[PDB]
Structures are given as structure tokens and as C-alpha cells.
Design a protein around this ligand. Structure first.
Ligand SMILES: [Mn+2]
Lengths: 21, 60, 554, 293
């Protein structure tokens, strides 16, 4: 569960950083 | 080969094993209780985190 | 840059993160500009689409709402290549969602040109994908006022026979849908071609597709009578069953006397589906047919059916109960009841079920004395399954038919059930006893039942004592604590001294059960002494159960 | 420590009542508890007045459910199962698991006896091994259940005057003292008194005979009559061989055979039967047919 949560959070923040670009 | 000295050494060593083993059991038990407590707390924190994240997504 | 991160998230190993990326294409759409969206994501969602079939479908679904973020109609062409590459997929539902998104997104001249292009793509596929792209191009040209009228007609005619049994079945089954968006002249020519294909339907699934096309024609398309005659000729076992499938829709519409005749004929394995459809046909007839034209066909079908099948007979009886008053219906009901007396148990089941509609027709209280004998002999047969079903039906008809009507005789039946051997029968008896008391009030209860069971509380077979215990357990719920503490409680406390340990720990169970019903003072005065006394027993089970009763209430 | 595993067992039984088996670890702990319970039972067990005797079951679990539906639920009705639980049926594992779970939970309300098909050899041949493997991908279950079968009491004695046992009786056995003086903690030997109790069967030819089955003998009437008289029994009940009526009265009301597995031999298509010993030791039989599939 922790691994899944960390993975989805990383993907979300990656998309947010893409928005930043 | 059965004999009283052997039996006594057997009971002594075996009782010692049972006691040290129950001790290791108790220490590992408390360890696992605290471990799952911490991991459940981390799951709850990540839940509040995902809630805040969807809130910010709706906000932005 | 956005296309790149889309590919990377689509290159993710986990199906869940990728599925999130799928659910998050709107994020990239809002990121880019609508012009940049159309210019970039459309080539991307056209070329670079490779994932799980479920994820491909999810992409198609997320695309189904992309007729706006591209720029509207003036760019529908730019949306057509990808759907084409998604209309040629091997999985049926994926290209089906593709056709749905095409019809959703389809200035429609570019969509029409690309629809002729999708018809060209269908020319390559020699399977149901041809019919899929054809149905797509149909609506895509209809968005441009069906400019591809001759093209749509030719596509339907080619799907009528294109060495593609899949696409041929699709055409011969849903020409009414694929040629619906096509031009009226194109639709009529495709209807002629569909009649030709249904005549050309040779296999069994071909016969089912032909029956479906004939039903769609008789629904939407003397021409009606001519098509109906062709369908009836095609309908008179495998092909006969596939045609009986739509025989009900044929009779569900003078325009049906031939259909009702065919239904009464084919049913007299094809007969099984025939009578299945004849259930709905009889419903529609009794609801719509004219009494003059009814009488003859009704009597013929009644004589035929009275000779699964019983289920259709009961359905037709309940439907024809829509007649105001028919002595012939009374004769049919009497015959069916005498049948259910000596036949499969399902006969009696369906008969007592439709007894509601029977009483709705005239009032089953009249015919009561007619059905009563059957009832009693259905309550005393060998196979305990039958007696069980009869018990299950008993409270419905009892509370349906007043107290005194049953209290004369049927009370003896409830008793005979309570004393029976087969445990399931006793259980059903107690449950329906609770239903009866709920419907007939505690006055009738205390006057009629409770004395009888409390008398039953003493007899050799300890099963025939625990049954009284269970009756008490289930009566306490509704009989109200007054009558309980007046009559039930004394007997329970007394049975608490039975020799058999089973009786004793069931006493404990029932005491724990009816505890909350009772008064706290009554509890502490009466039952707690008995409870601890039981806990002082030697049987470990009765000890455990008494301890449970204590810790659940005391 | 006590009510907790009781609740666990109740949950197990409830799960089992839906053809839903247990995990091999659950089966392991269950068989351990059942060994602990069975070790306190003589080779000839005594059961109080009211019971319900049922015989050959043979893994027909849905028919066992039908049985329970006929004769009452588990704790309410006292049962007595005379062996042959697991083979020639698909739900062997579920059947034996349920019966053992009951015996562990209500150790006083139910009693299970050893049977011909409780030896490792016969199971390995006739199928219980195959279902153990299919449903578990192991033999650990089939090991546990056999090491448990090696403890089941051989016989039961209801109200000191009804003798219940799978199979029949043997020449090396003259009185219940003899049976009670055996060693039942072993696998069924190929020849002995055990290989006859669980293998013999009555017949017409008086005196002993040769069993066409290959093990045990075929005790005639006189054998049973003298056995009853010399032991004070009023009736010997058994269940080892198919009886299409459901229950047969062999040797002039001295021996009863009660098959309790319906539609066992499909060419015959028998109906199962069980016997009820009421509060006054009066027997009354219930014949039932296979459940509706
Ligand atoms: Mn057997």
C-alpha cells in the first residue's frame, strides 16, 4: 500500500511539474 | 540412550530454550505491533495527503 | 513535451498508474492550447497508442468526449485517422467504442470524406470490422446530410454478402440500424437487400439473425402483411426456436391473428421457446385482442396447453384473468387445480402463486372449497420438498383469505406440520406461524395457537419439544411481553429441567433470545436463578450457552 | 483463549456450510485439535439416550447438507456417523472437514467412527488423495487427515445396548471387552480384528464365511445372535454396503444396515436413510433422496 501511494504521488507531482514547464 | 543425567540436561536445556524463545517472541511481538502501528499511521497520512492533493487539483 | 510525458506515463509498468494517465488526458488537454491540442495530441493519439486492451478501451472512452477540445466541427477530419486505427482492432468492444466516439464527434464534409475512407478501410477487413466501420461511416455521412447515400447503400449491400460470416450476420441482423442513418432511398434499397440476405440466411445463427431482421421489419418497416407472411413461412426446431424467439414480438404489435395461430401451432425443443414467447403473446392478447376473435383462439390454446410448459400455462391464466368474467376461465382454473393436485409440484406452486390474480378475477373465496382439498393433500405428500413449498405458500393465502376460513381446518395443518419429522418442515412451520400471528393479531394468537404449542411442550421425542421451544422463540418477537410472561415464560422455566441436554441448552438459547422482550425485574427475579442453575450443569454445551445468556444480558 | 477459538470454529463451520474449504494451515490446527479430542475416546464409545445414527457418506457434501436439513442442525440434534466419509465423491475434503469441525466444536453432540476408507492406502487409491491434491496442490492435508483417521474410535455403544460400527464383526472378537482391548492407534492392518470390524458384513450363509470383498468375513445369523446375547446388546447397527431401500434389517432384527448417501450407485440410484433413537431408545427411520442440484 505504501509503495502504491508513493508511486501515484510521484506520478501526480510529475504531471504537476510538467504543468510547471 | 536414556539415563537420568541425560534427562536432566535435557530438561534444563529445554526449559532454557522455552524461556529465551518466549522472550524473543515477546520482543518481536512488540516490535511488530509498533511496526504495523507506524505503517498504518503512514497509510493514514498518505490518505490525508491524497485528499489534500485532489483538493488542490480542484483548486488549481 | 506533453506528448512525451504522455508516452512516459503510458510506458509505465503498473497498470494502475497507466490507467490514471488514461483518466488524466484532460490534464494534458488543458495544459496545451486547443489549437496545440488538435495539432499535437491528435497525431499522438493517432499513431502512438499501444497498451492493454482494457487500457485501449479506456483511451477510446476518454476520447469519446474530445469533439470539443479539438476545435469543433471544422477539424473533425483530424479526429478520423485515430478512430480508424481504433475501428480495426481485433477486439469487438474496442472498435465498438470507436464507432460510438465517431458518431459522437461527427463542416461535416470532411467527416464524410473520411467516412468514405473508413468504408475503404472496412473493404480491407473481411470480418465484422467491415460492418462496424460501415455503421460508423453511415452516421459520419449522415452528419453531412447522408451525402454518401449511394456509398452507404453499396456498403450495406456488400455487407449482405462479403465472404464475412461475421459482417454478413451483422448486416442481416442490424440493417435496420446500420441503414437507419442512410438515405431514405438507400435505406429502402438496403431493406430489400436485408430481406434478400435473411432469405439467404442458411446457418442456425443465420436463422436467428434472419428472425431478428424480420422482427425489426415487422416492428418498424399489405407489405407489412407480406413481410409477416414471409417471416411466418421462415418460422414453420433450431431455426424454429430462433424464430419463436421473435414470435412474441410478432404477436406483440387482425394484424396478429395469424401470429397467434402460428404461436399456438409451433408450440403444438422449439415448443419450449415457443411457449416462452407465447406467455408474452397471451399477455398481449388478453390485453389487446377482441373478445369475439379472442374466444376461439383462447379456447384452442387452452385445450392445447392443458394437454416450463405448466409455467407458461400459469402465466397465460394469470394474463387471461384480465377478462372481466369467463366461466371458461373458471373451468380452466378448476382443471389446472385438479392437475396440480396430481402432477409435478411446480403445478401447485404456480397455481397457488397465481391464486392472487385468480381472486383478482372473481374472488378465490368463492372457489375456496374447490381448492381446499388439493391444498390439504399437497400438505400431506411424501416428498418433503412439496410439503415445504406448500407451507411456504400457506401464510400468503391464509392472511389473504381471512381468519375463520382457515381456522376451521388449516389450523390442523399447521399443527400437523409442527409435529412433523423432517426438520426443514418444522422450521418452515414456525416461520409461517410467526407470519400468521403477525397478520392475525395477538388476540387470535392467544386464543388459538399458543395453547396448542404449549401443550406440545410435553411429549417423548425431544425434537418435538425443542420445536415448541423454537415456536416460543419466534412468537416472542411479536406476541408482546405481556402474553409472553403470562404463558410462555412458565413453560420455558419448567422445560429448563428436561433431562435431555439439548432441550436444556435450547432453553438457555431461547431465554437469551426473549430476554430483552421481558422486564428487567422479571429477568432478575425469575430467569437469572434458572440461568445460574443451568450454568451449574455438567454438559459443557449447556454451560457455555447459559454463560452466553448471562454475559449477553445479565 | 477459550471462547476465541470457539468463535473461530463457528466461523469455520459457517464458511464450510457454503462449500468453501479451509486453508491448509486451518486444516492443520483443526486436525491437531481433533487429535487432542479423539485421544480421549475408547475403542468402543458410549453415547447417551437420544441420537441420530447415519452411515456411509462418501464425500457427498451437498447430500450431507441435505441430511442435516432432514434430521436437524448440528448442536440441536445428536449425531453418530459410522465411517466411510471420504471417497467416491467430489467434495470429500469439505465433507470430512465439516464433520471434524463439528466433532471439535460440539464434542458431546456428535460422534464419528472409523471406516474402511480411512486408511492411507484406500484413500490414495480411490480418490481422496486426488481431491486433496487438486484442491490444495499438496499432500499436507491428506497427511493431516490420515494421521487423524488413525485415531477415530472403532465402535460406539448407545445406551449400552445398541452396537454401532462400520462394516461388521469379526471372529477374533467375542465381547466388547475384546474390542476395548485392542490398539486402534495404527493404520488398518491387512489382517487382524481391525481389518474385519471395518470390512466384514452380514450374509445368509450361517457361521463365518469368506468375504467376496477380500477382507473381513461374512458373519451369518447365528454369529450375530450369539454375539448379541453374550454382550446384552439389543441390536447391532452398521453401514458398509449399498442398500437401495436406504436401510435393511438383516438377521431378523439383530443387524441393521443404514446407508446414508443417496444416489451413490447410479445404476441402482439408492435413497439414503438415517435412524433416530428417541428418548426411549425406540428407533424410527427417515429416508431421503438427493438434494436438488
Ligand atoms: Mn462405503
Amino acid at each position: 500500500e505504501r509503495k502504491g501511494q508513493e508511486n501515484l504521488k510521484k506520478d501526480l507531482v510529475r504531471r504537476i511539474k510538467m504543468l510547471e514547464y | 540412550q536414556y539415563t537420568i543425567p541425560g534427562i536432566l540436561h535435557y530438561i534444563q536445556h529445554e526449559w532454557a530454550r522455552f524461556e529465551m524463545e518466549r522472550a524473543h517472541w515477546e520482543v518481536e511481538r512488540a516490535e511488530l505491533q509498533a511496526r504495523i502501528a507506524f505503517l498504518q499511521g503512514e497509510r493514514k497520512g498518505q490518505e490525508n495527503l491524497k485528499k489534500d492533493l485532489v483538493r488542490r487539483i480542484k483548486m488549481l | 513535451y506533453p506528448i512525451a510525458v504522455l508516452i512516459d506515463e503510458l510506458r509505465n509498468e503498473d497498470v494502475q498508474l497507466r490507467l490514471n494517465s488514461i483518466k488524466k488526458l484532460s490534464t494534458i488537454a488543458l495544459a496545451l492550447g486547443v489549437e496545440r491540442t488538435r495539432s499535437e495530441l491528435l497525431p499522438f493519439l493517432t499513431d502512438t497508442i499501444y497498451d492493454e486492451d482494457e487500457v485501449l478501451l479506456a483511451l477510446a472512452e476518454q476520447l469519446g468526449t474530445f469533439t470539443t477540445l479539438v476545435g469543433g466541427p471544422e477539424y473533425v477530419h483530424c479526429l478520423l485517422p485515430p478512430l480508424e486505427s481504433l475501428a480495426t482492432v481485433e477486439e469487438t468492444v474496442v472498435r465498438d467504442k470507436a464507432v460510438e466516439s465517431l458518431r459522437a464527434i461527427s463542416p461535416s464534409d470532411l467527416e464524410a470524406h473520411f467516412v468514405p475512407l473508413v468504408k475503404r478501410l472496412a473493404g480491407g477487413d473481411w470480418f465484422t470490422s467491415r460492418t462496424s466501420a460501415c455503421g460508423l461511416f453511415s452516421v459520419c455521412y449522415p452528419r453531412v446530410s447522408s451525402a454518401v447515400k449511394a456509398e452507404l447503400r453499396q456498403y450495406f449491400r456488400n455487407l449482405c454478402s462479403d465472404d464475412t460470416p461475421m459482417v454478413r450476420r451483422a448486416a442481416a441482423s442490424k440493417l435496420g440500424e446500420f441503414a437507419k442513418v442512410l438515405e431514405l432511398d438507400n435505406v429502402k434499397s438496403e431493406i430489400i437487400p436485408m430481406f434478400s440476405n435473411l432469405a439467404s440466411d442458411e446457418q442456425d445463427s443465420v436463422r436467428l439473425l434472419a428472425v431478428e431482421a424480420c422482427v425489426n421489419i415487422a416492428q418498424l418497416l399489405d407489405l407489412e402483411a407480406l413481410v409477416m407472411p414471409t417471416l411466418r413461412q421462415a418460422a414453420e426446431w433450431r431455426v424454429r426456436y430462433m424464430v419463436a424467439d421473435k414470435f412474441t414480438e410478432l404477436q406483440k404489435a387482425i394484424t396478429k391473428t395469424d401470429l397467434v395461430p402460428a404461436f399456438q401451432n409451433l408450440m403444438k425443443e422449439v415448443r419450449a421457446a415457443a411457449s416462452h414467447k407465447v406467455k408474452e403473446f397471451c399477455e398481449n392478447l388478453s390485453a389487446d385482442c377482441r373478445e369475439n376473435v379472442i374466444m376461439s383462439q383462447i379456447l384452442p390454446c387452452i385445450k392445447e396447453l392443458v394437454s416450463v410448459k405448466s409455467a407458461l400455462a400459469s402465466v397465460i391464466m394469470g394474463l387471461s384473468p384480465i377478462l372481466g368474467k369467463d366461466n371458461t376461465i373458471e373451468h380452466l382454473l378448476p382443471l389446472f387445480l385438479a392437475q396440480l393436485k396430481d402432477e409435478c409440484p411446480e403445478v401447485r406452486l404456480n397455481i397457488i402463486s397465481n391464486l392472487d390474480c385468480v381472486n383478482e378475477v372473481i374472488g378465490i373465496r368463492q372457489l375456496s372449497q374447490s381448492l381446499l382439498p388439493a391444498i390439504v393433500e399437497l400438505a400431506e405428500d411424501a416428498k418433503w420438498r412439496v410439503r415445504l413449498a406448500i407451507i411456504e405458500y400457506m401464510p400468503l393465502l391464509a392472511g389473504q383469505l381471512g381468519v375463520e376460513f382457515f381456522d376451521e381446518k388449516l389450523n390442523s395443518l399447521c399443527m400437523a406440520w409442527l409435529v412433523d419429522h423432517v426438520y426443514a418442515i418444522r422450521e418452515a412451520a414456525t416461520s409461517n406461524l410467526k407470519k400468521l400471528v403477525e397478520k392475525f393479531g395477538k388476540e387470535w394468537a392467544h386464543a388459538t395457537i399458543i395453547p396448542k404449542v404449549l401443550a406440545m411442550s410435553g411429549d417423548p421425542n425431544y425434537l418435538h419439544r425443542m420445536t415448541t421451544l423454537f415456536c416460543i422463540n419466534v412468537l416472542s418477537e411479536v406476541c408482546g411481553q405481556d402474553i409472553t410472561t403470562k404463558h410462555m415464560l412458565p413453560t420455558v422455566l419448567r422445560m429448563a429441567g428436561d433431562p435431555v441436554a439439548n432441550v436444556r441448552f435450547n432453553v438457555a438459547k431461547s431465554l437469551q433470545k426473549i430476554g430483552p422482550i421481558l422486564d428487567n425485574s422479571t429477568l432478575q427475579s425469575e430467569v437469572k436463578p434458572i440461568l445460574e442453575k443451568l450454568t451449574q450443569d455438567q454438559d459443557v454445551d449447556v454451560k457455555y450457552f447459559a454463560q452466553e445468556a448471562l454475559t449477553v444480558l445479565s | 483463549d477459550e471462547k476465541v477459538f470457539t468463535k473461530e470454529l463457528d466461523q469455520w463451520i459457517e464458511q464450510l456450510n457454503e462449500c468453501k474449504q479451509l486453508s491448509e494451515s486451518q486444516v492443520k490446527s483443526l486436525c491437531e485439535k481433533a487429535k487432542e479430542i479423539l485421544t480421549k475416546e475408547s475403542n468402543v464409545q458410549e453415547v447417551r439416550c437420544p441420537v441420530t445414527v447415519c452411515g456411509d457418506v462418501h464425500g457427498q457434501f451437498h447430500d450431507l447438507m441435505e441430511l442435516f436439513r432432514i434430521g436437524g442442525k448440528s448442536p440441536d440434534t445428536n449425531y453418530l456417523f459410522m465411517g466411510d466419509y471420504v471417497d467416491r465423491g467430489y467434495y470429500s475434503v469439505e465433507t470430512v472437514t465439516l464433520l471434524v469441525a463439528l466433532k471439535v466444536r460440539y464434542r458431546e453432540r456428535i460422534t464419528i467412527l472409523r471406516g474402511n476408507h480411512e486408511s492411507r492406502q484406500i484413500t490414495q487409491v480411490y480418490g481422496f488423495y486426488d481431491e486433496c491434491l487438486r484442491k490444495y496442490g499438496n499432500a499436507n492435508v491428506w497427511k493431516y487427515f490420515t494421521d487423524l483417521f488413525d485415531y477415530l474410535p472403532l465402535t460406539a455403544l448407545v445406551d449400552g445396548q445398541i452396537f454401532c460400527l462400520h462394516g461388521g464383526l469379526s471372529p477374533s472378537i467375542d465381547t466388547l471387552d475384546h474390542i476395548r482391548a485392542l490398539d486402534r492407534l495404527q493404520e488398518v492392518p491387512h489382517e487382524g480384528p481391525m481389518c474385519d470390524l471395518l470390512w466384514s458384513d452380514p450374509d445368509d450363509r450361517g457361521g463365518w464365511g469368506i468375504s467376496p470383498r477380500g477382507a473381513g468375513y461374512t458373519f451369518g445369523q447365528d454369529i450375530s445372535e450369539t454375539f448379541n446375547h453374550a454382550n446384552g446388546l439389543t441390536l447391532v447397527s452398521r453401514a458398509h454396503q449399498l442398500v437401495m431401500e436406504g436401510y435393511n434389517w438383516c438377521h431378523d432384527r439383530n443387524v441393521v444396515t443404514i446407508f446414508s448417501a443417496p444416489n451413490y450407485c447410479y445404476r441402482c440410484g439408492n435413497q439414503a436413510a438415517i435412524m433416530e433413537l428417541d428418548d426411549t431408545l425406540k428407533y424410527s427411520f427417515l429416508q431421503f433422496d438427493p438434494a436438488p442440484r
